[PDB]
Design a protein around this nucleic acid. Structure first.
Lengths: 271, 46
RNA sequence: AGGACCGAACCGACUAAUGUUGAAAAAUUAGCGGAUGACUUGUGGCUGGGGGUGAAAGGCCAAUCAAACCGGGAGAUAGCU
RNA sequence: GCUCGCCGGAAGACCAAGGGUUCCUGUCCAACGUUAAUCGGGGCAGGGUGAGUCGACCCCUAAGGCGAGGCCGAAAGGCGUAGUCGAUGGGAAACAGGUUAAUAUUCCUGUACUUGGUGUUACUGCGAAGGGGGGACGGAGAAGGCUAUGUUGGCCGGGCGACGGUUGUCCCGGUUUAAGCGUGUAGGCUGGUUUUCCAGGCAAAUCCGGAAAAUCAAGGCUGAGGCGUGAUGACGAGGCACUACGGUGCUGAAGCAACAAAUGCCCUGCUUCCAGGAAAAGCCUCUAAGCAUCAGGUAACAUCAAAUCGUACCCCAAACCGACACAGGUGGUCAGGUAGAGAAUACCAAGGCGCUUGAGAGAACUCGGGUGAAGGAACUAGGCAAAAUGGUGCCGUAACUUCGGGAGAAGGCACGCUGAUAUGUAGGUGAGGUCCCUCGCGGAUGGAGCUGAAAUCAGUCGAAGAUACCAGCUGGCUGCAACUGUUUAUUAAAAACACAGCACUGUGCAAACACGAAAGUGGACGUAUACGGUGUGACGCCUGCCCGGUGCCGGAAGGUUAAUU
RNA sequence: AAUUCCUUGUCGGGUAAGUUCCGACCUGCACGAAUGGCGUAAUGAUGGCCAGGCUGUCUCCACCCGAGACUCAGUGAAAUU
RNA sequence: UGAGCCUGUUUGAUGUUCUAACGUUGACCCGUAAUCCGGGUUGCGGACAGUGUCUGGUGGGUAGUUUGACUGGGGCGGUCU
């Protein structure tokens, strides 16, 4: 649910939280954890390459299954969990042969549910099929771009995709950005849409909240000197020039896509 | 008040040591110049 | 519960006096701000000069910065004293 | 040698980093020491550092470095696989007493402990570069059991007081004992055993994982403390005889209880929250190639080994960083008494010091302080500076408001000592005795002894009872920024920067973008509820007209236009 | 008015007397709506103004307690010419 | 379907199909005890993408430089044959 905090302190007045009384209160599955170290935006040359990154809380990595290629053996959901590396929850599933794995959580999935994969699975949420075997007009998530590679589309919280048509050996899809695209019909997808649709109703309420997640302050270019930015200078508050990036290119309208190898798979750009 | 020099043997040796100088091409030029001049002490190695 | 409240250790530097061939090439005395957090501290590591880092003051890079130190071109040029 | 003064959460005690003979003894006063010097961290000579258990070396890894082949670059060189290094982190084992001028968990005395090799006996399925377990991990809060430690009694030894009293309800001192071995408590967690089957753990598995039956309900792991032994020992005021004044040899009393009590231990525990909290080896288990008379493994004895390097001294300072015997800087551990909420503050204990020029006199003026008649900001750019308020408990408290606040708003009243309630009250702790018991570090009842607030009534002293150190001044009207934060080391701390919130725009993943002649890397082990750039700056009511100029987005009919032919 | 030169504009309140402060008027030399407009409880070592208590800031200075300055013995500089 | 040439000859333009150069930061096997590298098999693209020489456009991101004299001081004004 979504809950407001009471104004007992100036830093609690404008905080809205998301609370789910269904996630595990305990430790995650250990055989599926790895190490994850921070960078600060530096590369192998030691130079800052992406700005405004640094600090935060220690995190461990969960190995999640995006391929879903263990066919013919049903599974059961055990518990939902928390993952600090993404914006969606995950689920721990047990197979009839005695194996466990991690997957993304669809909407409407609770403990004790059955899931299956293959070319002969039922059409219900949580199942994985090739798009050759899914009706036109369905809603799917975690869609592949090449056969056998792994899900790459619609992986955030509350996202989905539609199958709009089919011809030959290709399928046509609509993306959350308003774009139409072609992918091979042997690619895989999972039924339903991702969960945690209320992740966008939270208000942090103070700067410490942003610091906790690893975000450093942003400095405006009009508050600098003319040797640090194309915007700096002036005796007061003066702009008198067209906005540009810190490296001279014009923001606010100019386009930056140039890839001729892929243009055959776009049917209409986002509107 | 705090001053500039703060000693540390490990850092001294890892920075200006004989093996550090030998590890690259220009440290060997430094050694050649000092040998040509005829110095009694060649590096900070004690 | 809290980037909550009064206040020592710890981190700072708003006011006055002394000092200015000083006890000190930035300090002392009496008052002053924060003090569970965007907090503070020990050891090691990475970023090199038209380059680095900067919650942005032309700030900092070994008492030196509107372009560091050292050795070379070099006995640069000086219608000037 | 006697008196006086200062510190005592340090100006006491022990270390890491750094320094390297500054340590003890004999001798000397040229230079050094801001003065003299018989003195010194000064000159000269000799002496002093003793380890299977303390560190280092050693086995294992983190950030990161190097890197056979490899990829890339005019040369020089760059980035990386298999590997190899790198602590601030993980991995076996010792306590008490005595001793020198200088060392002590190392030397002596007494009692312990751990890891390897060889040999003899008894039984037996052993074997990894592989699978599984464990090592193994966050912030805040709370209260129960203990110890370190202190106070008062009892016991032992000594005293009967320089000036009134002191044979007593009087004064002084002591009352200490470890590691190891045995018992397994306060408490924490977890159902136990047996049989069958299986698309999983790159091959196998008696191990891990999943499924099905029957039986029993109590089995297992963890754990401070207390108690016994160590100990017929050691220590201990005092006394017995010699003194080069440093000691020698012997003897040696008592050596108990109650109360109070930690920021230390049980605790890597329990409860709760979101920002969701390292790796590998040592250790325990399972098998493959292979050996099966052998090799190996398990247990009890005898025996050998545990090498090499550091060990003196200073360490909030005269020995380290500041050119100085410099009012500055520097990480960890120890934590007594009275008053007190307290690691604040005042006086003391153990311990350590009086800071390396002195002696007189008591002018103007400078520095740091105390008191002041009448007036009370008239001073000054400005209440700058100085003066003033200051504790606990209880009455009582406005406009405005985002309903939390404003608020400790403002303004008042009590406060010492003695006696009674009560020869010590309410509460806390808790022995002897009596019962039960699956017999023990047990359960029920009982109240001796110790400790001990707060309140009411009645008397009494001073000018003053929160008497010393310590310890908010309060109110009214207005500009700016919403708030906590950050900034010009060394003349500017702010209305400047950041901030949670809002909007425009780019980006379909070999993403936009950035560091790189390139290989590659970050963005990200992320996927439009995600990521980059730009402007505004909580919240409330709002954000009107102009596309002529300069940018950006779309169109392609016409006009002009490069190399090439 | 952090914006208004003429300017101490004109009217009202506070003072015996107010170029600063508070409330209004409109003649905006030269305000104005995300290089945002108008409000706003709480917070500020932020700028301006008014009161109570307090006082050596002042009329107007007087006395006392310590460290120098003065004399005696020892050691023994500096800028400048 | 545009030029020669008589349905025959060779070069152009637009378009649909193909595989063998070329790409693969798709899947499996080996060197091997390996998320680099190389080879093998197989899907998807495909004469497109990308690179070398030449050539038109944009380019304060970066670099080297210029911006006159007389004058009752310099600047503004005026002048320079």
């Amino acid at each position: 649910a979504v809950v407001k905090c009471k104004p007992t302190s100036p830093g609690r007045r404008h905080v809205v939280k998301v609370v789910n009384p269904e996630l595990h209160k305990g430790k995650p599955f250990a055989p599926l954890l790895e190490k994850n170290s921070k960078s600060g935006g530096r590369n192998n040359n030691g130079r800052i390459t992406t700005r405004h990154i640094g600090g935060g809380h220690k995190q461990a990595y969960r190995i999640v299954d995006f391929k879903r290629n263990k066919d013919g053996i049903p599974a059961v959901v055990e518990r939902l969990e928390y993952d600090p590396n993404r914006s969606a929850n995950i689920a721990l599933v047990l197979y009839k042969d005695g194996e466990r794995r991690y997957i993304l959580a669809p909407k409407g999935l609770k403990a004790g549910d059955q899931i299956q994969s293959g070319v002969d699975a039922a059409i219900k949420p949580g199942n994985t099929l090739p798009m050759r075997n899914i009706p036109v007009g369905s809603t799917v998530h975690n869609v592949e771009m090449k056969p056998g590679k792994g899900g790459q589309l619609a992986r955030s919280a509350g996202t989905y995709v539609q199958i709009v048509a089919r011809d030959g050996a290709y399928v046509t899809l609509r993306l959350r950005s308003g774009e139409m695209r072609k992918v091979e019909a042997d690619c895989r997808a999972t039924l339903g849409e991702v969960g945690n649709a209320e992740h966008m109703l939270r208000v942090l309420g103070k700067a410490g909240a942003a610091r906790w997640r690893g975000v450093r302050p942003t400095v405006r270019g009009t508050a600098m000197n003319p040797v640090d930015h194309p915007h700096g200078g002036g005796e007061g508050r003066n702009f008198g020039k067209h906005p540009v990036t810190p490296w001279g290119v014009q923001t606010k309208g100019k386009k930056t896509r140039s890839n001729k190898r892929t243009d055959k798979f776009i049917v209409r750009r986002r509107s | 008040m705090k001053r500039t020099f703060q000693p540390s043997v490990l850092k001294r040796n890892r920075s200006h040591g004989f093996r550090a100088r030998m590890a690259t091409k220009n440290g060997r030029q430094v050694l050649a110049r000092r040998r040509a001049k005829g110095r009694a002490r060649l590096t900070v190695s004690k």
